[PDB]
Amino acid sequence: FGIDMNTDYTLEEVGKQFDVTRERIRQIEAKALRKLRHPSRSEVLRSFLDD
Amino acid sequence: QAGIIRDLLIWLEGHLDQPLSLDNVAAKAGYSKWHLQRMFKDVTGHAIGAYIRARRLSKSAVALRLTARPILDIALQYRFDSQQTFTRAFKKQFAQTPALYRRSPEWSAFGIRPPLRLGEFTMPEHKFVTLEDTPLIGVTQSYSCSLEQISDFRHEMRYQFWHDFLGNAPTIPPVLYGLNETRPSQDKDDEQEVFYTTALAQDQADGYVLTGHPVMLQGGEYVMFTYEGLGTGVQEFILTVYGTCMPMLNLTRRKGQDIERYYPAEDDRPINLRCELLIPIRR
Amino acid sequence: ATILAEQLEAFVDLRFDPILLRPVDDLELTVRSANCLKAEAIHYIGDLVQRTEVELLKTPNLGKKSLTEIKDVLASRGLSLGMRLENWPPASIADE
């Protein structure tokens, strides 16, 4: 996503980092939405939702 | 006994969503993981474990065809483990890519498995009709909600549309018309959107100054799904025609606007209204 | 006079556990642990804390994992198995 970085690292640059993988590493991020969708954490981010 | 498994599914159909469940979580129902499994095998005719995650996929298949979410809203939404495995078991259930599945407007009930009742099942009736192009007038608005919210959201879309017009209506039109639409995307064929149109009937009152469009009803084969129940009972009636009567009557509904036929002619007691769900069908 | 009178009265006068409110079906227990206990005509938690577990679980709708939810729920609130209560039932208490 580009937090704390100058450039934004892509799934092929990521594709040599942890694994060759391109689905389950994306499905790591599918857990990342899913572990933050649960409505106790997603409500500090609801204050900035007004756009 | 026979009173157990019937009550377990009243939990389980209501807890097919919330707990991330295998038979270990289902083993908190009086006996062990095997004996509760042993008690299910003979009183039902189904085998519980591979059925439930498939029934939860059958709960997700109608979420894959009539809900407006992408693949990763519903990747692990129904308590799964992976997406490619979810894509894999989908091939052995529907024999179609889920990108291809929400590519086609035709929704055939091949792999949807009906919700099981150990008690007595309220069977709806059918009657195959062929309808006519009828002009009406009504407005449209959209939603993005749950499977249980397929008529919780839909209660207001007819009511404030009716009570705005009833403020300037000298009559009460007694035949109601509601139209659901499935329209997929172009970027990635995993998403859709839904514009719901309730309309006022071109009836004995000629002057109907209502905001909206003159809507010509779709022609072709239809089914007279008449019913007895309140608008909160069409919530489970829409689910028992679309979770069950498309698989159990083995029919494939066709592309087009699903015609609702409510009756407002009996509009406090809870009202047991009568309603038809005239689906455009390809038999 | 009276408005003057009452303003003079500044100087002439001035110098229970909430989950015990609920029946047995209203506690959200496990797969079969809440709907099965009402079948023994036990219409309340206060009526259920009055008895012991020896005369509950042996009915063949009540199971071994319909048993243990009396062990932990009273331990989370501090009650006993057989606790007779003084004022358990609410105003209009009935069954379903």
Swiss-Prot record, chain A:
Family: Belongs to the sigma-70 factor family. RpoD/SigA subfamily.
DNA-binding region of this protein: 11-30
Domain text: Contains 4 domains, connected by flexible linkers. In the active conformation, the domains are in an extended conformation, each making extensive interactions with the RNA polymerase catalytic core.
Range covered out of full length: 563 to 613 of 613
Mutagenesis / variant outcome for changing R34 to D/E: 2-fold reduction in activation of class II Crp-dependent promoters
Function, in words: Sigma factors are initiation factors that promote the attachment of RNA polymerase to specific initiation sites and are then released. This sigma factor is the primary sigma factor during exponential growth. Preferentially transcribes genes associated with fast growth, such as ribosomal operons, other protein-synthesis related genes, rRNA- and tRNA-encoding genes and prfB.
Entry protein name: RNA polymerase sigma factor RpoD
Segments of this protein annotated with the region Interaction with anti-sigma factors: 22-37
Compartments, record wording: Cytoplasm
Annotated region described as Sigma-70 factor domain-4, given as residue ranges: 1-38
Superkingdom as given in the UniProt entry: Bacteria
UniProtKB/Swiss-Prot annotation, chain B:
GO terms for biological process, alphabetical: regulation of DNA-templated transcription
InterPro entries: AraC_E-bd, GyrI-like, Homeodomain-like_sf, HTH_AraC, HTH_AraC-typ_CS, MarA-like, Reg_factor_effector_dom_sf, Tscrpt_reg_AraC-type_HTH
Keyword DNA-binding: yes
PROSITE patterns to which the protein is assigned, alphabetical: HTH_ARAC_FAMILY_1, HTH_ARAC_FAMILY_2
Keywords linked to the UniProt accession: DNA-binding, Transcription, Transcription regulation
Any one Gene Ontology cellular component term annotated for this protein: cytosol
The keyword DNA-binding is annotated on this UniProt entry: yes
A GO molecular-function annotation: bacterial-type RNA polymerase holo enzyme binding
Every HTH araC/xylS-type domain range: 6-104
DNA-binding region positions on the chain: 23-44, 71-94
Domain of life from the UniProt record: Bacteria
NCBIfam families linked: PRK15121.1, RobA_TF
Function according to Swiss-Prot or TrEMBL: Transcriptional regulator. Binds to the right arm of the replication origin oriC of the chromosome. Rob binding may influence the formation of the nucleoprotein structure, required for oriC function in the initiation of replication.
Protein known as: Right origin-binding protein
Source species of the chain: Escherichia coli (strain K12)
Swiss-Prot record, chain C:
Presence of keyword Nucleus: no
GO molecular function, one term: protein dimerization activity
Residues bearing the modification ADP-ribosylarginine: R32
Region (Alpha C-terminal domain (alpha-CTD)): 16-96
GO biological process: bacterial-type flagellum assembly; bacterial-type flagellum-dependent cell motility; cell motility; cellular response to cell envelope stress; DNA-templated transcription initiation; intracellular iron ion homeostasis; nitrate assimilation; regulation of DNA-templated transcription elongation
PTM annotation: Acetylated on Lys-64 and Lys-65 in the presence of glucose. PatZ controls acetylation of Lys-65 but not of Lys-64.
Family: Belongs to the RNA polymerase alpha chain family.
Quaternary organization: Homodimer. The RNAP catalytic core consists of 2 alpha, 1 beta, 1 beta' and 1 omega subunit. When a sigma factor is associated with the core the holoenzyme is formed, which can initiate transcription. Both the N- and C-terminus interact with different regions of transcriptional regulator CRP. The rRNA transcription and antitermination complex (rrnTAC) consists of RNAP, NusA, NusB, NusE (rpsJ), NusG, SubB, ribosomal protein S4, DNA and precursor rRNA; S4 is more flexible than other subunits.
Domain commentary: The N-terminal domain is essential for RNAP assembly and basal transcription, whereas the C-terminal domain is involved in interaction with transcriptional regulators (such as CRP) and with upstream promoter elements.
Purpose: DNA-dependent RNA polymerase (RNAP) catalyzes the transcription of DNA into RNA using the four ribonucleoside triphosphates as substrates. This subunit plays an important role in subunit assembly since its dimerization is the first step in the sequential assembly of subunits to form the holoenzyme.
Protein name according to UniProt: DNA-directed RNA polymerase subunit alpha
Taxonomic lineage: Bacteria, Pseudomonadati, Pseudomonadota, Gammaproteobacteria, Enterobacterales
Shown residues in whole-protein numbering: 221 to 329 of 329
